[PDB]
């Protein structure tokens, strides 16, 4: 199983990818575990930015890694196609994209159509960004089979039952829960990782959740599960999104500059007080030795 | 009350914006009795548009009427704000924004500062657009009154008691309902109308249904309302969004070019099947001598 | 258009029906212009009551009024078969049951013949009251149509596009809706009335609400409509089903008793709280010669 | 961790409670490796059943195993304090109640009161039976705290982050899922078992599964979960609670009598097209050495 960060974006004051702090984050990440990185995902504000955006999100990052899922979707299907086809001469993982999102009541054949043609056009194996939170309308495992050119799936839908449908009707099919929640329960259980915003700051509990369930020590797994939950629903005080920025400053020591308008960065007294909430995480982190003080 | 479209916005064989069809299709929805025109909607594929294309679209439109909103949200805050302030040479009703769409989890102080930020530099009066299916999250009649400055909404919602509530947190404030099955009913109780995709192929039908209602004689307004609410339903067998170019084309003669993919235009058996789904409704409704032949 | 009261149940202290009580509160709500009572509905707990409660309810109401709709619906149906029975002896305008409620997935075509059941050996008219929140699942225009027995309904939705389409589907069916919420919105689009908890405590705004927007007065039944309203709220806040009692001897003088465990009575610091939030509120109802002091 | 059957409950065709039937059956379900029965739940119309049924069933099942669960809850608090008290005099694992279904917006203060006064009275532990698809209304971990005196948890959220929500704030806690699709993983990720409605009619695949996953084989019990989700899936076509009558006759070879009306029994070509659904999965289960002939 996996360990996948939905790489944030840093953003300068004026509002531009700063490329160094990017590449900064990439190397810790990879240095802690993670084995790939998910460019250009919700975390990273993929929908905020432009296709060229998009590129030097990738041609940064690329920079420091191969292990790139390199997302590339979005409402114009002739961006999301030329993005594909850019990646030719990148040797990554794969490309994703999300189910147009936004937009209710698509036909099937529609979005079946539109997938297709993703993989028809692209250099690199298609992953299905499976999204409905965000996007509305669900792509489960029966219209991922009908597709049929899938090599794996992130599913943001918490109902682990509708994930483990993936492996049942793809056996072949690679299949991660978007969850930080499940990183125990997702290895334990067969399913090949997580793509865990939370690796983002604290990529060395996810890392280590995994590897503690694989060595079957599944109750300590659960018990540090439990605390990585606890910063998990902190972030979501004042928007996750926002959160994100401030927690990798906290835990892994560098900042990731500003997020992108309209995702405003916390104010002082919002940054001060979800702090507070993790300080006693912090502490009983280093306590384990899974943090360096 | 009023009916307002919004506007399909009609694209070429190679994907850009067609002043010349759209130009038609405007001067066409005044003439029938449209009251204004809700400019880079979700029927418009509004998203799918660059803030340059946003502003074709204002640009395009305001060379036939001035009775427009212009639809300026996305996920770049600086953007909005562009074309915000862009929009102070035209002399139109309002603008317009979603929530952040996609994003969840966002703070309801951040969804705040986003509304408010936007009040700020508009040159116009600002309508929420609250579209809680396509973004997840919803701005409610709360919400919509802690911001405090939207002169009014169009509310996405088919439960019209959240629809009224506008109307009752914000009494100065003008309420739309974002459904085509609730004319008669919005216009006998009391709210300031319909913005009605269904008015881009049928307008006859949404203002006369429209002005029925006004005159009290609810039963055949809901006599009315009925034909186009099964109108409306044909019109999601095959997609909505594309089967409103092939719907504007038959009822009122002019095509619309084609859509914008990922919203893919329907084929011929599609097309062929749909007609089949509204071609008694056609009859009735020129039998009724609302549709001319 | 009618108003219909889903009355309250009062109990006595040692948890049975208080018949006289109930007379009491049905003579008061005839004389405040309620049209018909719904009897053993969510507000009279009738899924507390054995068959037999059920029964005495009907008789205790039925020695005030003719004017009942007697709920006879459960999750035993031999249960609900006898009760429909033994109405055969009564004046009054129906019968009524909900769907088989708690158990989801159950069959269509087991639901369909289950209220057809009911109508062929009913000896009154048979009502839908069709309340997807308590049961779960919806029995919706098209389901009512192909059950074909069914002489009006109860819709606890507040969508209200789902309510008009039983009169689109069925025109002549008699359509209710069960929110205190759309009195206003429900007279003045064509729709047959409410069924509406809260004419148990205001028999006399419900009723007003009404008249208003039927005398074409549609702004001032909306500005008694959101006074209603926020009655309405105030009563969610300690349960509405609770709270119901307190405000029936607040606003119409006489008590109802307790409700039947577990339906707590509110203890005397929830009691004092609820009155304060409609003190002002009954204040302006006097105000207006509305309630008389 | 163990896996747990809501006993269904056989009728007569007059519709009383088969103790023949119920006895057989609850014998053959200990014998093929069930841990525990839990009695008068869903599967079981527990809601069906009047308080004197629900004692009945408590009665039979007690003749042939003291490893009982009783489910007590109702719509009258009295009812199941009565069921309560007199559970005294057998030695059973718990107590159990539902919250009470069907009424929406129960204040939080009075749902904790109801359970409190449920463990003031019982002679034995008290079990949490949280099914939000039937009451509508939740009791998660966070509120199954500030009751604090469940013993255990039986979650039928088929989201099993809300199911180790449980594990975590009441670490003490028993906490079991109602899913037949989550034995396999259950049991890997350290919680405490499955309460299956499909364990009435394969006992052997679900106790199977169990031991897999117990014995860190996760491949092969998710081989087997498969097919056991397929039986589960075709249960649901014809209403899964008549099924699982014919479910248990065809697997087990004895048969369960009749479900209670409006539970009707499937019709025979019901039935017909049903094993035709599983009759390839039977096979392969007996192949597999699971099933005898």
Known sequence: PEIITPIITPFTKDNRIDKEKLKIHAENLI???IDKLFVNGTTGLGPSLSPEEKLENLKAVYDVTNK????????NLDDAIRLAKLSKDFDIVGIASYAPYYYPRMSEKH???????????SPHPVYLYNVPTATGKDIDAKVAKEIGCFTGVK???????????YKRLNPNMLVYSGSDMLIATVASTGLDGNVAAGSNYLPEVTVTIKKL???????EALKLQFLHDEVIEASRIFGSLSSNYVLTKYFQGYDLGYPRPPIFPLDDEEERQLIKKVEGIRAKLVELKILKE
Chains 1, 2, 3, 4 share one sequence.
């Not at 790139?68 to 409402?75: E, K, N, R, T, Y």
């Open 31 to 33: 240095r802690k575990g």
């Open 68 to 75: 790139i899922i390199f997302q590339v979707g979005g409402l």
């Open 111 to 121: 979005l079946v159509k539109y997938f297709k043609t993703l993989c028809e056009v």
């Open 155 to 165: 599913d943001c839908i918490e109902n682990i039952i509708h994930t483990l449908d």
């Open 213 to 219: 369930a694989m060595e079957r020590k599944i109750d």
